[PDB]
């Protein structure tokens, strides 16, 4: 209807904020990876142990190519 | 009250915002809704709606005669588009947000605060002297000299 | 050297607590004190340079009391909780106020001031 | 007296417009712990006076030569930013407290406390003389005070580099 | 399962092909689910804003705050503390 409308205003939103965050800050994430962040740190993750992990498979996938 | 102000500082006044003809704009009096502390820096914001009310009368009212002059005044307005366009882009602002304060409405002028003041004088000695013919290309040049560098 | 008083009605198993917390405002209260004075020009360019990297410590000190207050409002702050969560504020704003308390014993100014720093986690 | 109300008066404190009124900006019930620490914010605001009565006293006379514009107009370079502090300030008040300002506002307590005494070493100097008195400035060795008045001294000495590259006259 | 899709963005696979490093990653997630630090938005907030100012980038040190409160307007958000600690430290 309408309350189902304007969430999903308010998440495209906050999600293109936090994507300015990202740049300034230089990430090398991108729009897509970042909502996978996103999602896992709401339902309650050590940060210290998810960008671990991301600064793991990001050093391994350069032993491949 | 934002839009209502946006206006006052765009030529209309309106109850809130009371016009003398001598004085200039400014608040009528204390106002139970906002805060007693504002009535000052409304006052501050006044002092720069006072010139471009005084500048559109004059740029209107061509005010002596001459080329020289209605150039003058020709130009006189592409120095003023700047904040005009500054003017429009407040209400887009306030229009996202609504927790946005008279503060940052404040802030966002700051330049136009500091550039009327200076270009104020250069008109008042023209109206006041009686600068006839192509000496006006020389009373704004010994202006031009000026330390400020946004003047 | 500052003095401190609490209350005359109060639980003694607290009072007893109370006086293990103050020394390290005391010992603060030497140290912002040192700032605000030895940064006067007639000091040389040495107390003034070790006043300033003694200010950024003030200000991580700053924001230590910042998230205790905003951890405060949940409750989850127990008196008991709090001895802990100063300890390492505890011992920085010690060493800070021993060296604000001996550069100003002795006058020193210039190199008599970074032979003390190095002399004396 | 709630402690919010007081973070809205020091946000204009801050300014010179004045529970908080006006040399100490005496507050006027609540708490001693609450009127200590407004003392000391509120006083913050008072030197910002000190600092935008020079720029405005000395932006009408018309006989402040040319290096006391670019000296009058190089103090409001440095006042847009602490205009931009106030705006980020201000949006929270919307949560930040009494003890959350002091650690906000530790550092432009400093460079409004070289600003407000570098006025009033340099009060009757016009001309070159003024560019020679914001340079005595230059030798403190602080690095955040060198590093600042080292930058007016870049822009006040531009217009005696002007004449140079172009020492009293006679008419 | 969510895990799994995860190191199928990063790494550009299907789950049958890398199982290798999803067996690390269930190493370390899990054994350390539970977080162990106070959770307070205030503190990372005064540490995103440190950050964007030592970049001399002070302009979008007052912009984030703006995007900060927004978050907080619309309220789908449950824990904002840890969504911010971990877009700090990436």
Known sequence: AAAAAANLNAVRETMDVLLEISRILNTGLDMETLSICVRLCEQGINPEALSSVIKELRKATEALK | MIHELLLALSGYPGSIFTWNKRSGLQVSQDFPFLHPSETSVLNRLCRLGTDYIRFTEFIEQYTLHGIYLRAFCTGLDSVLQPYRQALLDLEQEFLGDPHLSISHVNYFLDQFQLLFPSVMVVVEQIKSQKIHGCQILETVYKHSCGGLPPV | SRTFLVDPNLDLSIRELVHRILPVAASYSAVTRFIEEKSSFEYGQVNHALAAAMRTLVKEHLILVSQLEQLHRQGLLSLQKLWFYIQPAMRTMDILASLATSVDKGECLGGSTLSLLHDRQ | ?171 | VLLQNLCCRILGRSEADVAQQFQYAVRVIGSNFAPTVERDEFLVAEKIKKELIRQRREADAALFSELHRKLHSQGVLKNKWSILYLLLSL
């Open chain 4, 1 to 171: 007296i709630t402690e919010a109300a007081l973070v809205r008066d020091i946000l204009y404190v801050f300014q010179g417009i004045d529970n908080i009124k006006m040399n100490c900006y005496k507050v006027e019930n609540l708490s001693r712990s609450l009127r200590d620490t407004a003392v000391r914010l509120s006083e913050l605001g008072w030197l910002h006076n000190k600092i935008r009565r020079y720029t405005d006293q000395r932006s009408l006379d018309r006989s402040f030569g040319l290096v006391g514009q670019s000296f009058c107009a190089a103090l409001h370079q440095e006042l847009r930013e602490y205009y931009r502090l106030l705006s980020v300030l201000h949006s929270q008040l919307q949560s930040l407290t009494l003890r959350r300002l002091l650690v906000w506002t530790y550092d432009p307590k400093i460079r409004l406390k070289t600003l407000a005494a570098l006025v009033d070493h340099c009060q009757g100097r016009k001309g070159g003389e003024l560019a020679s008195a914001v340079h005595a400035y230059t030798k403190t060795g602080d690095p955040y005070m060198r590093s600042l008045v080292q930058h007016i001294l870049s822009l006040v000495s531009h217009p005696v580099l002007s004449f140079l590259y172009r020492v009293a006259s006679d008419p």
